[PDB]
Amino acid sequence: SGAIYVGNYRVVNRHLATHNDWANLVWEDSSRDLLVSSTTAQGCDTIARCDCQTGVYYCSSRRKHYPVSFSKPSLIFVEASEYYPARYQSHLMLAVGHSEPGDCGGILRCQHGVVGIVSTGGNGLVGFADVRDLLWLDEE
Ligand SMILES: NC(=O)[C@H]1CCCN(C(=O)[C@@H]2CCSC2)C1
Ligand SMILES: [Zn+2]
């Protein structure tokens, strides 16, 4: 579990969104595994606006932050699960690292701010949903 809290927005994995998220919806995209809902309180996270390919992510199944090298946001095949049929998830970045069920929502960050959230794992790989292109998260 986990979210990004920037301005009056809450960014979560679409497959983990709550009823309150859907009832206060700003934007969602199944192909990216992202959903954004509105918040009453202002958040403290800042979004990175950069092309970093190195950063640090939080792994809840290890209670640890790990430094990783990750690929550029791309269209990657994701195996069928209880949450989506086999498909291609867009704007996904892969790294070598531990990710298992319970880990979606952990933040990936760089020197500039939050880069994205854990969206996949298994096989010694971790996949992150990028948010750096969502410029509207920084305003209104
Ligand atoms: N982004 C996806 O399609 C996710 C949905 C949940 C299932 N996915 C996973 O990778 C599992 C949970 C973390 S380790 C294995 C794919
Ligand atoms: Zn950066």
Curated annotation (Swiss-Prot):
Signal peptide: none
Catalytic activity: Selective cleavage of Tyr-|-Gly bond in the picornavirus polyprotein
Binding site for Zn(2+) 1: 50, 52, 110, 112
Annotated active site: 15, 33, 104
Assembly and interaction partners: Homodimer.
Summary of the function given for this chain in its UniProt record: Cysteine protease that cleaves viral polyprotein and specific host proteins. It is responsible for the autocatalytic cleavage between the P1 and P2 regions, which is the first cleavage occurring in the polyprotein. Also cleaves the host translation initiation factor EIF4G1, in order to shut down the capped cellular mRNA translation. Inhibits the host nucleus-cytoplasm protein and RNA trafficking by cleaving host members of the nuclear pores. Counteracts stress granule formation probably by antagonizing its assembly or promoting its dissassembly.
UniProt name for this protein: Protease 2A
Included stretch of the parent chain: 869 to 1008 of 2193
